[PDB]
Motif scaffolding. Structure first.
Motif, PDB file in Angstrom:
ATOM      1  N   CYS A   1      10.803  10.135  -0.351  1.00 40.60           N
ATOM      2  CA  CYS A   1      10.686   8.866   0.400  1.00 40.60           C
ATOM      3  C   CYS A   1      11.947   8.018   0.244  1.00 40.60           C
ATOM      4  CB  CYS A   1       9.481   8.058  -0.079  1.00 40.60           C
ATOM      5  SG  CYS A   1       9.372   6.486   0.836  1.00 40.60           S
TER       6      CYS A   1
ATOM      7  N   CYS B   1      10.532   4.447  -1.597  1.00 45.96           N
ATOM      8  CA  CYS B   1       9.934   4.397  -2.938  1.00 45.96           C
ATOM      9  C   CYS B   1      10.355   5.558  -3.821  1.00 45.96           C
ATOM     10  CB  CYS B   1       8.384   4.370  -2.872  1.00 45.96           C
ATOM     11  SG  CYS B   1       7.545   5.874  -2.439  1.00 45.96           S
TER      12      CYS B   1
ATOM     13  N   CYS C   1       5.913   8.015   4.501  1.00 50.00           N
ATOM     14  CA  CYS C   1       5.387   8.078   3.145  1.00 50.00           C
ATOM     15  C   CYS C   1       3.942   7.592   3.127  1.00 50.00           C
ATOM     16  CB  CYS C   1       6.213   7.176   2.266  1.00 50.00           C
ATOM     17  SG  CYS C   1       5.643   7.084   0.514  1.00 50.00           S
TER      18      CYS C   1
ATOM     19  N   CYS D   1       4.018   4.028   0.896  1.00 48.50           N
ATOM     20  CA  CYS D   1       4.717   2.807   1.310  1.00 48.50           C
ATOM     21  C   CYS D   1       5.137   2.752   2.787  1.00 48.50           C
ATOM     22  CB  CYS D   1       5.959   2.549   0.455  1.00 48.50           C
ATOM     23  SG  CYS D   1       7.372   3.679   0.863  1.00 48.50           S
TER      24      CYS D   1
HETATM   25 ZN    ZN Z   1       7.333   5.732  -0.156  1.00 47.85          ZN
END
Ligand code: ZN
Lengths: 274, 9
Positions: free
Chosen positions: A136, A139, A160, A163
């Motif tokens: 990701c 994150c 993701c 997030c």
């Molecule tokens: Zn993420």
């Protein structure tokens, strides 16, 4: 004086060379049918034209990627595991491994065909990354490449699940560092007693500079359409250039090594499994 | 990790 292809084959046959390091680039995979994303003519090229790419290499630049990830994922869909098979060049390197000669294979390619040919991961340095894993961009959560496959094949940018950031395959983009395994070159290249360079223009750093890291006594065999890079401007006395089509140079070396029938048997059995 | 990925031109 100057070594020939036959000289290199005899160094291997006489077991004067035992620890071969290999560098390869996109030229070893064009025989598998992989279209060059830069070249007009293919469906891949035409699909990339629908977007606002200012030039082809923006597909591997992060500012462009974050502006529009669709061109990169169009390439990812084309190159994702399963669409292409390794060719004779990959299986030559696999047979080289099986015959106990492969110290390490450094690749610039992202098609994953080295591992598909059955070369163990421990023997490979995928210097420009892999679609086998993804991260990701927000994150930094990691994912198996399989986890984004459904999205990629459906022409959806993978997001993701925690997030909603864009999830980017672990391909090295321009301006990013190479993977941790690239640092194996510090111990591999001094240990090598033969360097093979196949199917690359040596136009991308720091990969290209690896050609200078073998000891001065070590032959460097280039099998490539053109004389290139550090071999063109810093020639060494035991360099050998086998200029021409990569697959034909490989076939010639395979015959000189005494491996032809074995290579054909390996290729039949492996491409059959795929 | 010998430098960042970069085009020699
Ligand atoms: Zn993420």
């Amino acid at each position: 004086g100057k070594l020939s292809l036959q000289d290199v084959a005899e160094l291997i046959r006489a077991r004067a060379c035992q620890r071969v390091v290999v560098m390869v680039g996109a030229g070893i995979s064009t025989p598998s049918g992989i279209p060059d994303f830069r070249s007009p003519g293919s469906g891949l090229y035409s699909n990339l034209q629908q977007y606002d790419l200012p030039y082809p290499e923006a597909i591997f630049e992060l500012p462009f990627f974050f502006h529009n990830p669709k061109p990169f994922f169009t390439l990812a869909k084309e190159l994702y595991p399963g669409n292409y098979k390794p060719n004779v060049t990959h299986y030559f390197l696999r047979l080289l491994h099986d015959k106990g000669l492969l110290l390490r294979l450094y690749t610039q390619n992202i098609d994953g065909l080295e591992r598909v040919s059955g070369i163990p991961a421990s023997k490979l340095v995928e210097a420009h990354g892999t679609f086998a894993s993804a991260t990701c961009t927000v994150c930094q959560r990691p994912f198996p490449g399989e986890d984004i496959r459904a999205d990629v094949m459906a022409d959806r940018v993978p997001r993701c699940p925690v997030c909603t950031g864009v999830v980017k395959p672990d391909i090295v983009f321009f301006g990013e560092p190479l993977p941790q395994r690239f640092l194996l070159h510090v111990v591999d290249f001094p240990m090598a007693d033969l360097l093979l360079i196949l199917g690359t223009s040596l136009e991308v750093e720091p990969f290209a500079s690896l050609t200078e890291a073998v000891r001065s006594s070590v032959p460097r065999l280039l099998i490539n359409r053109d004389l290139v890079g550090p071999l063109a401007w810093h020639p060494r006395s035991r360099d050998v250039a086998q200029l021409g089509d990569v697959v034909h140079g490989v076939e010639s070396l395979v015959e000189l090594l005494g491996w032809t029938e074995e290579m054909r048997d390996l290729v039949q059995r492996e491409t059959g499994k795929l | 990790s010998y430098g960042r990925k970069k085009r020699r031109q």
